[PDB]
Amino acid sequence: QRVTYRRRLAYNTRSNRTRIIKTPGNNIRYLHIKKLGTIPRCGDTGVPLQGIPALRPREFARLSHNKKTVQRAYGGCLSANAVKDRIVRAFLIEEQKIVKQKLKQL
Amino acid sequence: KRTKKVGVTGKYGVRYGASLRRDVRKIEVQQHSRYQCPFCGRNTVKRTAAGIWCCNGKGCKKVLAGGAWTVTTAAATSARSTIRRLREMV
Amino acid sequence: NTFKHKRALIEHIQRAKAEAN
Amino acid sequence: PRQISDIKQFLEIARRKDATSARIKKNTNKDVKFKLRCSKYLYTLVVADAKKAEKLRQSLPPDLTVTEV
Amino acid sequence: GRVIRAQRKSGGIFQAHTRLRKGAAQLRTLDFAERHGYIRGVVQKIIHDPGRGAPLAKVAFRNPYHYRTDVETFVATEGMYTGQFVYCGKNAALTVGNVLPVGEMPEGTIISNVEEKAGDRGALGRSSGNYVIIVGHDVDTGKTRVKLPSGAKKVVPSSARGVVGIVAGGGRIDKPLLKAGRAFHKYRVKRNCWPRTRGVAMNPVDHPHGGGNHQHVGHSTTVPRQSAPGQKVGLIAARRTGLL
Amino acid sequence: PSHKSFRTKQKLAKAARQNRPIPQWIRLRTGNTVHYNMKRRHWRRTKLNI
RNA sequence: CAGAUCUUGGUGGAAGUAGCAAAUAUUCAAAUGAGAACUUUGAAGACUGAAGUGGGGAAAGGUUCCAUGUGAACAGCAGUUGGACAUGGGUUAGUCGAUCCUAAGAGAUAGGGAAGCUCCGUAUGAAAGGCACGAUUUUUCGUGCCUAUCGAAAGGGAAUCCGGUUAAUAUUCCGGAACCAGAAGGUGGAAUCAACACGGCAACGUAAAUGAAGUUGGAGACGUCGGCGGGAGCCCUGGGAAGAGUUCUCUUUUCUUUUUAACAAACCACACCCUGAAAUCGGUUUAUCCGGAGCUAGGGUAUGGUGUUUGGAAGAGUUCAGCGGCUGAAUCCGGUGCGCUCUCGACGGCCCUUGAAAAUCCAACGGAAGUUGUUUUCACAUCUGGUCGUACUCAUAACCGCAGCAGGUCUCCAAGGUGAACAGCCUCUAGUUGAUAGAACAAUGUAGAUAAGGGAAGUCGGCAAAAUGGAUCCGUAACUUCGGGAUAAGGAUUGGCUCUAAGGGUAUCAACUUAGAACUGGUACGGACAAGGGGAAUCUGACUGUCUAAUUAAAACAUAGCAUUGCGAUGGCCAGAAAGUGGUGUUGACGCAAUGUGAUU
RNA sequence: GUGAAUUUACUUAAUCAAUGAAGCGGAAUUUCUAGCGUUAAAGUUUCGCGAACUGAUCCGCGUUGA
Structure with a gap:
């Protein structure tokens, strides 16, 4: 047929x-x-995010909040390794500027 | 070894002239050869477009501005040395 | 390109590690 | 359509006001299907046991419209 | 008796094909921070500009006045990598990729994307592998003598900015194209300037070089500068002619 | 085609109504000089050109 | 008025003449009827042969659709038939499109030109608009904070499926089953006096689980080629069951029917995580990538249907057996793959080419606000969804060619055998049997065939024709840019049938693919179909590519390469009547503009 | 056009370049890393995210540059 x-x-x-x-x-x-559909990309590394389905943009509006996010800082925006690099880099550079402030204040 | 002289330019057959195929052979070998990544040391840098050299190494993923057919050019290396010399004397 | 078939690979395996042992 | 695996769930949905009608379907394998037409879904309960079938059928509310195959 | 191909290049089908362009490559607008200090930006991505032999670099700066991020499109210099910090300003260091006033850089510095005049965001040395050389300075007049890729010497204000390094993508012209097809693809993203029919292969109504029983010009192909638009063909105002 | 505008269907509807034979009682009137419709159209022969 | 190849209209001889010859083809009976080569039904013979003469759509047409009716006229014969003539009837949408969005591009406004018609200009030399706080502030308002429109029935995009139904309409109606968006409050649950939930080492999970301004990210959203793997439909296939064809003979067989939608639920392993530290280096793809930036191994997390299981749903649809609408049955259990179409996955190659935007949608960061009360992207019920398009053709008769014209006109679906094949040839489903016919075989002709002996003597010229031709094996020169030439040239082989020999998976299954060995036949053999003639050299253009639509396809043009010229922006080149005008230019000498030669040597 | 002794200078007329017309002229006196930077606050003086004043100098005001 x-x-x-x-x-x-x-x-x-x-x-x-x-x-x-x-x-x-x-x-x-x-x-x-x-x-x-498309799994959302990561904002820093650009890889697909883990734990979120592959829907069309308007089709995402029918999911509950937890299905579109990951319970972590930047969850649903950044991958786990990207978030970890954000955390370590933030803390280390804050430590650096503290040391430089101590050195230059005297 | 299948071809004696043409190598990669054996895909061009008998056309365009021996000398032009010869010049293309040098450049195409440079253009497609894998390069060591200056950031991760892996041999993972390949050309995406003329002047753009991207590393496919896991965790590095660095993208480079460079020469058209080779990652680094003689003019860039020579002037980087001079610029380093100029900044040191300043 | 060696081991033209499954049997040929088998015989190579049999002779290997037997000449050694 | 929705499948219900619990008899008391079927009664509860039948008790709900959105229930409109009910169908009893007798299959060739002596398995009955109790189907309940609601506003949004056709709720179906597959009862493979005969004795549970008619006690459920008499358990259905008298006001509900129950229909033969 | 007909308008010639050179005259018809005033637009229309001869416009630039500009759909796939990745933005106009420009320096930061000369602001207070870049006039008096330096501002640091991050190289986000090195990208291919269709019709351009050199890569572009998307660099994200901070707005000194508002909580927002300004992303600038630069001409990438060789050695620029994603994640690199680029400093623009008077007090910037002399490192490859940094944008400094030409007056603050020593004689002989290799620079690219140099400004003709203070604030026009980059005019000179923009093509792949090209660069400008700081010949010298004249502090009394506030000027800087530079060597352009054509070998000409030019004076620019000492406040004009220039990117340290050579434009990436050098050696792009060395490789022969081998193909009308590859020349077709290269010019397919630039404009309608290819292929090119010779004037001698035309008819008299179409070109000064057209006509005759044999393909010849019949007059000297070196033409004045005062000549008419339909006359400016061949070698215009040639001082010297021929291969040395 | 099947895809029409409303304006086209109006013009087509009027063209259809004007493409009819004349009523017979018109032909019996006093002083009548009309016998057959002189503005008739066929779909192959003459096109509406809208 | 006799003239002007006079004007308009009419009519002759030619003349019952040229002609009605492409697309294989019709025949018998019956019906209807005044009338049948042509209408209809049955029977037969055929063709299109899935890249169709099939089933649909887009552009275009417009009622040609459908039923009924029929003196003409039209269908270049005929006509009882017709897209013709007449009379009526016929297109039903929250879900399919248009509408919405933006693209190239159009185009107001601000302005500036122009005697003007009007031109330019599109965030520009524009005062081009908003949002929030407050015992109400001198009951005359203060304090803060930051771009038109049009343009896509092939692009982007909210959400519908099955069965049935009419003379003609269906994802639109009917029956059944869903879905989307928006809105309000209600019910049940969840958080909260430890204000805004817990678990997991982690990847992250859970039915919930407040989040303003502001900022940021994602999706939308993307080339082309090549193989590989998965799924679906199709094809194929072993049994069972229903009928049907065949039955001199043979055939546990030949054929048909064996079906399951959206939607709903549950289920389901390249990336990532955890422990552990690896060289006698290992893992691994058809394709060589990966690992002290943590391999292998082990255990996890995520992604999750066109998959499985069930609901829908057998009551439907299909097939058969009876009865006078009804009653009985069956609608079963499996295999297989370098198969086909579509799709998905993970990859590889290519570029001086890197292969749209926007509307919409979601997320994050931030922390404003905040015994009752607060919240609640959670499960449920509740209501609504306008306007226009919708018949039919889409072509050897519905479009454009003056026409029912052998021309042209975008695209989807795509069975079996032969074979490498979507080739040719033949067939199944479907469609058609349409193109004035009949009888005769004169010359000439058009279109095909064949021909003894010779073999280009023909002719301006081997023009036309013939010859060759698939595959396997052997063999292959000069020359060369070393890549080619090359299928060079030259030889041999090819059927049928009975056999073995290997090549895979878990004793057993599945699958065509090559090597022989005989035996056999008017020395047959790619047996029809299909399907290069070749060689030695000159002139010339390097090559692929482009042009005189409708007498010239070439050595002409283009081309890569080579070279010259102008130009560093207040500039070169080009445009405009003008302009506060445009193009190159989202450009910067590895650039643009102007030319001349024409690969290499 | 305005000055200073053909020689120099000035800019308001016109010309050119940039932008969201942000820091111009005077005086007083941020660089080992692909992270985040907003919705002031401490200080002072009146009376809680109510104020004020500074935090974040003043003055000129010609949007800057040629």
């Missing part, structure tokens, strides 16, 4: 994505499907 587009859009494009199904009436048919 051959199939047709269910819409008046010909021209398979990045939005005219179709799938083959067998209906309970023994018919081969297209189901028009959307583009795959």
Whole structure:
């Protein structure tokens, strides 16, 4: 059995994505499907974030807060290693400027 | 060893002239060879675009501004030495 | 490109570590 | 559609005012399906035991509309 | 009897293809902090500018007046890496990539993206592998003599800024293209300037060099500077001509 | 095509209504000089050109 | 008016003449009817043969759709038939599009030009608008803080599926089952007098789990090629069950039917974490990458359907057996892969090419506010969703070519055999059997075939034709830019059938792929189809590529390379009537502009 | 156009460059690291995130630079 587009859009494009199904009436048919979702990228390293699904942007609005975030500082914005580097670098440079302040105050 | 002289420029066949294929051979070997990363020491630096050399090493991921076909050029090295000399005498 | 088939690899394994032992 | 694995859950949803009708479906494998039409979902309970089937059917509220296969 | 190809290059299909450009490469606007001290920025990413032989560098600075981050698009110099700190100002150090006034740098310093005049954010030595040399200073007149990549000597104000180092991407012209196709792709992101038909291969209505039974000019191809727009073809106002 | 504007369907609807034969009782009137519709159109032969 | 290749209209001889010859093809019976080569039904014979003569859409058309009716006219024969003529009927959306967004680009406003029509200009030489605090402040307001619009029915984007239904409409109606967004309060639960939850060493998890201004991040959001792996449908296949074809004979067989949607729930291992410290270095892909910046190994975390299990849902759909709408059954259990289409995953290659924006959406940092009361991105119920498009054709008859014209016109789906193949040839589903016919085989012709002996003697010229041709094995010159030339040239081999020999997975299963060995046949053999003739050299352009649409495809143009010239911005070059005008220029000499030669040597 | 002795200077007319027209002219007197920097506060003086004054000098005011 051959199939047709269910819409008046010909021209398979990045939005005219179709799938083959067998209906309970023994018919081969297209189901028009959307583009795959995307796991949010990390803000510093750019890698995908761990613990968050791959949804479309508007589709994220239907999740609860914990499903879109990770229970950590910058959770849902930065990866674990990126956050750890932020923490260590912040503390070390604050220690450096304290030492330099001690040296230059005298 | 499959080709005796053309090497990487064997993909060009018999065209464009021997000398032009020869000059391309030097540059293409430089352009595609893997380079040691100055930041992580791994041999992980490769060219993304002319002048941009990115390291694929895990944890380093450094991106470099450099020469078109080689990571470092003679002109840059020579002037870096002079600039270092100038700053030291200042 | 050695070990043209599974049997050839087997015989190489059998002779290896047997000449050693 | 929703599947309910608990009989008392089926009664509780039937007690809820959103329940509109109920269907009893007798299958060829002697397994009954108790289906409950609500505002949002068709709640289905698969009862494979005969004796639990009719005590549940008489357990269903009299005001609810129960319908044969 | 027809408007020639040189005359038609006033725009339209001869405009620059500017969809994929990654911003205009400019120095920081000359502010109080960069006039009197230095401001430090972080190199976020080295990026490829379509139609440009040299990479660009996205550098994030802090606004000295507001809680916000200003990201500046620089011409990357060789040795610039992501995560590097770049200091711009009078009191900046003499390190590769730092932006300093030309008057504060010693004679013979190799600089790039040099300002013609104080505050125009970079004019000279911007192409890949090119640089400007600080020939000398004239403190009394507040000027700096510099050597341009064409070999010309130019005077710029001592307050004009320049990036220390050579523009990255050098040696880009050494490699032969080998291909009309590769010349097609290079110019496909710059403008409609390729391929080029010779004037002698045209007809008299189309070009001064067109016409005749044999492909020749018929007149001297060295032309004056006072000539008309339809006449400025060949070698315009050539002092010398021929290969030495 | 199937995709039409509302303006097009209005012009097409009026064109359809004007592409009809004349009522028969018109032909029986006093002083009548109208017999057949002189503005009739066919879909292959003449195009509406809108 | 006899003239002007006079004007307009009319009409002749030619003339019942040229002609109605591309796309294999029709035939019999019956029906209807005044009338049948052409209409309809049945039977037969065929073709398109999945890159269709099939099923759909976009542009364009506009009612051609559908039923009924039919004197003409039109369908270059015919006509009872028709896209023709007449009469009615027909397109139903919160979910499919348009609308929304921005793209290249258009285009107001501020301004400036112009005698003016109007031109330029798009955050510019614009006073181009907001938001928050307060016993109410001299009951005459104070204190703070920071860009139009149009333009995409192929781009971006909220959310619908199955079965059924009409003469003609369906993701729109009907039945059943969902989903999205917005809004209000309500119910149940969760946090809180230790104000804004806990657990996990960690990756992070949990049904919840306040977060203003401000800032920042992500998604939206992205090339092309190559193999590899996963899924789905298809193809293929072993049994079972229902009918059906075949049955001189043979065939536990030949064919058909064996179906399961959105949605809902549960389930499911390259990156990351933990312990541990590795050289006799190991791990590992088809492809050589990885590791003291922590390998291997061990144990975890995350990602999670087009997967599995169930709900939907068998009551549906399909197939069969009866009965006069109804009643009985069946709708089962598995395999397989260098297969096909789509898709996903992890990778590799390539670039002097690095391959959109914006609307929308989410997150973080920050810490304003804050016994009842506060919060609550948690589970539930509750209500709503406008406007326009929607029939039909999408083409050997619905579009454009004056037409029902052998022309042209974007794209989706894509069965079996032969074979490397989406080749050609043949077939299944579907579609069609349409193109004036009949009878005759004169010359000439168009389109195909063949020809003894010779073999280019023909001709301006081997023009046309022939010959060669797949695959396997052997063999392969000059010359060369060392890459090529090269399928050089030259030889041999090819069927059927019975056999073994190896090549994989867990005793046993699955799968075409090569090597032989005989035996056998009008010395046959890529048996139809398909499918290079070759060699020695000259002139010339290096090459791939481009042009005179409709007489010139070339040696012409382009090209890479080489070279020259102008220009360091108050500049070169180009444009504008002007301008507070534009292009190069989101540019800066490795640049742009102007030319001439035309790879290499 | 304005001055100072053809020679020098000045800028308000015009020209050019930059921007969000932020620190111009006088006087008084932030560099080992890809982190964060906002929604003042201490000090002083009146009367709690109510004020004031400084924190964060004054003056000129020509948006700066050629």
